[PDB]
Design a protein around this ligand. Structure first.
Ligand code: HCD
Length: 117
């Protein structure tokens, strides 16, 4: 429940929304709106409109990077935590009003499990 088996690929984009990525491989399996690293970049580019809402941006950046550009190692990615997802619900409430959170970014425990290291 804490990890997902998947195939790892070398990172094509070395930075996630300004944040450095201290690992070599990733997977697009958690971002259900994205089937390639190029598409991941284009979806993150859309999300980047939230840079104009800094309180949300500060909360949502680690969530987006954990989902869109996760560390992949030995054919597995770690799922983001329930806690990390919950931190975004109030400062990024505008997302829910403007369009709605995609299902893979709603804090259900199948996508964001509890009690994992
Ligand atoms: C006050 C303003 C700065 C707030 C701006 C907020 C944004 C940039 O106006 C947000 C609100 C809803 C967001 C969208 C919510 C859901 C999705 C689906 C996802 O697959 C791609 C990103 C995308 C399309 C988001 C892009 C950024 C949006 C479109």
């Amino acid at each position: 429940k804490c990890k997902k088996t998947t195939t790892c690929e070398p990172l094509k984009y070395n930075i996630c929304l300004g944040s450095v990525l201290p690992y070599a491989l990733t997977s697009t399996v958690l971002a259900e709106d994205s089937s390639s690293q190029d598409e991941v970049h284009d979806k993150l580019s859309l999300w980047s409109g939230l840079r104009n809402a800094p309180r949300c941006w500060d909360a949502i950046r680690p969530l987006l990077c954990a989902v869109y550009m996760p560390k992949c190692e030995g054919g597995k990615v770690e799922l983001p935590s329930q806690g990390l997802c919950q931190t975004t619900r109030v400062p990024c409430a505008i997302v829910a009003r403007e369009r709605g959170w995609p299902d893979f970014l709603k804090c259900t425990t199948d996508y964001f499990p509890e009690g994992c290291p």
